[PDB]
Design an enzyme around this catalytic site. Structure first.
Site: not given
Ligand SMILES: C#CCN(Cc1ccc2[nH]c(N)nc(=O)c2c1)c1ccc(C(=O)N[C@@H](CCC(=O)O)C(=O)O)cc1
Ligand SMILES: O=c1ccn([C@H]2C[C@H](O)[C@@H](COP(=O)(O)O)O2)c(=O)[nH]1
Ligand SMILES: NC(=O)C1=CN([C@@H]2O[C@H](COP(=O)(O)OP(=O)(O)OC[C@H]3O[C@@H](n4cnc5c(N)ncnc54)[C@H](OP(=O)(O)O)[C@@H]3O)[C@@H](O)[C@H]2O)C=CC1
Ligand SMILES: NC(=O)C1=CN([C@@H]2O[C@H](COP(=O)(O)OP(=O)(O)OC[C@H]3O[C@@H](n4cnc5c(N)ncnc54)[C@H](OP(=O)(O)O)[C@@H]3O)[C@@H](O)[C@H]2O)C=CC1
Ligand SMILES: C#CCN(Cc1ccc2[nH]c(N)nc(=O)c2c1)c1ccc(C(=O)N[C@@H](CCC(=O)O)C(=O)O)cc1
Ligand SMILES: O=c1ccn([C@H]2C[C@H](O)[C@@H](COP(=O)(O)O)O2)c(=O)[nH]1
Ligand SMILES: CCc1nc(N)nc(N)c1-c1ccc(Cl)cc1
Ligand SMILES: CCc1nc(N)nc(N)c1-c1ccc(Cl)cc1
Lengths: 511, 511
Positions: B282, B304, B330, B390, B411, B414
């Protein structure tokens, strides 16, 4: 060994017309009750009061429950009080003595096994006597930040510099600022001075393997200003000496943080006078999206002048800029982000993105949204600016109780000069936003990148750290009914209440 | 009567090979060992008990261990064999030989009471096995070497050896931060066998004074992962329950801060397995300014995909977007800030602000500059994005010793799913930049806005908090000579060393 407990104005006022000078202060009363009552079984505390102080008390509350009441009097008698109200079961009868030495004599003679602590509770007659005899080990002082009409005063004492600007009493406890009925106050205590972890211990000992303090005597540091003061001390003690764009030496740290409550009081720093006229006018200036510094300068706010001069604009390679023009600076990006800049005289209405309006509309319609942000950083417009934004970003957040909080990120922090100004600025913005959106102001959170004190400020800041902070003031929005939108705020719609800072300290702006 | 074991261990319990230590020299460990075994409160000294081969594996200039009573357990070696090996120095004790460990402890009682303070079993496997069998071990000083090495001698299996790897008891009471010597990461744990001076201030403190904790028994919390763990516990205990864009419930807080060292080890969280392949791919995706999520999806990184579907693009009111197109996100704003976006297939070279190049060039030429920032937040282009960034801003800082620090503002966080990933994502960037600018990586500082845990993660997070963290791994950049610019990096130029995390925990992404 006696203690004094008092609520007091900055000019030592304690009473008027045999009554309290201020509206009811609920938290101070809870504080008084708690200090005077609490004991470790067999013992109760002793409260010593004067006749007029006894009389000022409402008949419901007197006598103070669970405490040995003592009235110093010549005219009142023990039966006058006995006939005033029937004595309740399980309470000690009110004893009347001629003088305070006599009142203490009675404690030794009759009560030497019964009482733990003695408290002198008022008024000016007993406080003065207790100070004369030097029997006072500690002073529990509620500092009322507002000045009220008074006819009875607490006597002057060596160390009354905690109240206002001018054997000793030094502060050992300073609390955060509370407020009730629009009256700011805080609590101080002054002292008369004149194998569980044995296995862990050797491992820690090898690990650790290797000066400037703010108000060292003050042990409990509840006041939120201590953040700023410890932040100064931190950079002086642990920071790194660096070179600088300004040519002046810098001692720096990276990634520091502070947070201030907005629910009780306003974080207008008390350890030195803050130019509030400057913070207010600059914020209103920001909100209009004004980029002309001469509008601030004509109002007596010369904060931007040194950075919009002909000589500075030319060093910035902007010879076409008129003197005063900050270019597409902070305010412009707030109200017209990405709009094409011409000069400070151009009307930019409708152009660019109005971040401030979008932040408010989102707050008023969907407060759980996580994209409530306002940025001044525009990489495309940085070279056109007189100076790149220091405070470049802020985010807003609403909780369960319709309480608003604001984060602000600053890339570069002049601790001595800029920071107290920046704290007050975005804290004010929060209040203004909070009102327009129908929210309670809760908290301002300050995120700092390059955090630095200039070498030519060091001596002046060392002077500032000997100063124990005063209670924070209250900022009121006046004409609340008239103000419905963020653009409706004017300079006169604000009132700073109970601000009693230490004297101004001169600090030169690194040009 | 009770003894303490002191060991340096491989994840697979390995302690030695070829009558020697499996790893290169770890100075800090050798310091740790020297101090814990020697330190005493006058008249007494400590005793070290070892096997015959542990004595032989030891260099001659070091044996016997100075200022410590040396006891060797042997049947072949005699006391005169050791005495003829080296002349006894003045003041030191004569080395004793016993036929067994019970015989060793008996000698310590018979002849060495009033003489010795603490007893330490120092190896090898034979003595550790006996000391655990007897159950005389009150504490275990374990140095967890995170890297696997060839070994033929192993520390015995014990209840609570889950601190080493995945699968009366020995529970941790101390976990230190990760150290490293010679490219070998390690930390220190201590296990335990379980199966009116200031009082006149306390009453005011009493009324001002006021459920889930991570690994609460661990008292010393050196390990920097505790920041993340305590942040989870803090949100759950003190956070507020809000609604959310996704519809899924949220417990949230505002203004949260973490910082991680980068000089010794890498903050790839160990308390759950982090998808590192995802963080690497990424970030390289970002660096290229790539807005095509299918390039990640083809490589097995589907992080994504749920936000680039036909359905989500339409709910964002972007019908014209091809599936995969994240819009000007980004990657785009980093390398081409402000540039007019068409689609993911267009070449944008030379368009917009290249913030990454500007940051690096400033670092390599003028490191004391306070404008070394990179932002992804572009209010003009937000609506065209599939998801507003984010992690939207990062700032760099260089100090006296050419060390690089990095702050990243996020900002929305999660905490369950995104935070661990983001910590690794920017810490890796700091490594990458540091190398390309000839700087030593120092620290990653995380600034967090809306910090929240999803309500469907709460159960899985409570499970995670029962796990004590493992030492951090080292991330090595391979082929350093080849890589000179930020764009030179590839997926193959990295090596995670000594990563021993706990099992993966399933956490659904809130769409
Ligand atoms: C932040 C970021 C990049 N991102 C992009 C991304 C996009 C939208 C999101 N939306 C929300 N609500 N939470 C997120 O963490 C999130 C993350 C990620 C998205 C998913 C996973 C995931 O499914 N978990 C991994 C485990 C990784 C870990 O241990 O943290 C997996 O095994 O699938 C990881 C990163
Ligand atoms: O790189 C990232 C991408 C997404 N998120 C999580 C945080 C938020 O809970 C969610 C996006 O929701 P909004 O903040 O857009 O409502 O995705 C992350 O923590 N890191
Ligand atoms: N904010 C605060 O902390 C407090 C404020 N107050 C305020 O203070 C006012 C009352 O105080 P004040 O007016 O000073 O009256 P006092 O409570 O000091 O009492 C005065 C009377 O008590 C007797 N007395 C007091 N001191 C002595 C002494 N040293 N020796 C002998 N007799 C003594 C005198 O009786 P005689 O004339 O017969 O000799 C005198 O008339 C009220 O307005 C009340 O609201 C009261 C308590 C706390
Ligand atoms: N990383 C670490 O924490 C440490 C690692 N090591 C490594 O481990 C190796 C040494 O360990 P190891 O191979 O187990 O050898 P040991 O140090 O356990 O010694 C084995 C010999 O000591 C005697 N002995 C040991 N235990 C007993 C017992 N219970 N009763 C009677 N005699 C006993 C016997 O000698 P005899 O035949 O003479 O009777 C036996 O042959 C080395 O390679 C060293 O580098 C060593 C110490 C610490
Ligand atoms: C931050 C900010 C806004 N600004 C804008 C501004 C612009 C460039 C800067 N440059 C530098 N190096 N430091 C600054 O603090 C600074 C501040 C200010 C500028 C000057 C003063 C000033 O001259 N001092 C005030 C004292 C106010 C206080 O005590 O905080 C004065 O008395 O004149 C204050 C604020
Ligand atoms: O609101 C402000 C504006 C400016 N500064 C100070 C911090 C920096 O030292 C200086 C700007 O110089 P650079 O950071 O651009 O070098 O002004 C502040 O502290 N607060
Ligand atoms: C509760 C106000 C209060 N606050 C403080 N800090 N001290 C006090 N001594 C008092 C007080 C109030 C009423 C009487 Cl009658 C006497 C004393
Ligand atoms: C210094 C390495 C070390 N680290 C730890 N944590 N424990 C140990 N017991 C040892 C050790 C080293 C050499 C010998 Cl000969 C015996 C023990």
């Amino acid at each position: 060994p006696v203690c004094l407990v008092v609520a007091m104005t900055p000019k030592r006022g304690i009473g008027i017309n045999n009554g309290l000078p201020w509206p009811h202060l609920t938290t101070d009363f809870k504080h008084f009750s708690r200090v005077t009552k609490t004991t470790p079984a067999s013992r109760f505390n002793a409260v010593v009061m004067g006749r007029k102080t006894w009389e000022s008390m409402p008949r419901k509350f007197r006598p103070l429950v669970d405490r040995l009441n003592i009235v110093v009097s010549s005219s009142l008698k023990e039966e006058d009080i006995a006939a005033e109200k029937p004595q309740a079961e399980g309470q000690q009868r009110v004893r009347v003595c001629a003088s305070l030495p006599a009142a203490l004599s009675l404690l030794e003679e009759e009560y030497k096994d019964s009482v733990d602590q003695i408290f002198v509770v008022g008024g000016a007659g007993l406080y003065e006597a207790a100070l004369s005899l030097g029997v006072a080990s500690h002073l529990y002082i509620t500092r009322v930040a507002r000045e009220f009409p008074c006819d009875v005063f607490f006597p002057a004492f060596p160390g009354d510099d905690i109240l206002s600007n001018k054997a000793t009493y030094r502060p050992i406890f300073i609390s955060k600022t509370f407020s009730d009925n629009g009256v700011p106050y805080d609590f101080v205590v002054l002292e008369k001075r004149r194998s569980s972890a044995a296995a862990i211990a050797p491992v820690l000992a090898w690990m650790d393997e290797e000066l400037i303090r703010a108000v060292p005597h003050v042990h409990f540091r509840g006041h939120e200003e201590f953040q700023y003061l410890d932040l100064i001390a931190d950079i002086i003690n642990n920071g790194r000496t660096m070179d600088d764009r300004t040519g002046v030496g810098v001692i720096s740290k990276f990634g520091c943080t502070m947070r201030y409550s907005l629910d009780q009081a306003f974080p207008l720093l008390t350890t030195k006078r803050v130019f509030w006229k400057g913070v207010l006018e600059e914020l209103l200036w920001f909100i209009r999206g004004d980029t002309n510094a001469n509008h601030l300068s004509e109002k007596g706010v010369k904060i931007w002048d040194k950075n919009v001069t002909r000589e500075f604009l030319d060093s910035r390679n902007l010879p076409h800029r008129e003197v005063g023009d900050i270019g597409p600076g902070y305010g412009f990006q707030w109200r017209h982000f990405g709009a094409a800049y011409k000069d400070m005289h151009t009307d930019y209405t409708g152009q660019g993105v109005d971040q401030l309006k979008n932040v408010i509309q989102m707050l008023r319609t969907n407060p759980t949204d996580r994209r409530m942000l306002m940025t001044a950083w525009n990489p495309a417009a940085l070279d056109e600016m007189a100076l790149p934004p220091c405070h470049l970003l802020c985010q807003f957040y609403v909780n369960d109780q319709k309480e608003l909080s604001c984060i602000m990120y600053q890339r570069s922090c002049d601790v001595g000069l800029g920071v107290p100004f920046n704290i007050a600025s975005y804290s004010l913005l929060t209040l203004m936003v909070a009102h327009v959106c129908n929210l309670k102001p809760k908290e301002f959170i300050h995120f700092m990148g390059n955090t630095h004190v200039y070498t030519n400020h060091v001596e002046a800041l060392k002077e500032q750290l000997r100063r124990e902070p005063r209670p924070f003031p209250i900022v009121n929005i006046l004409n609340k009914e008239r103000i419905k939108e963020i653009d409706d705020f004017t300079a006169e719609d604000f009132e700073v209440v109970g601000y009693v800072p230490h004297g101004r300290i001169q600090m030169e702006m690194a040009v």
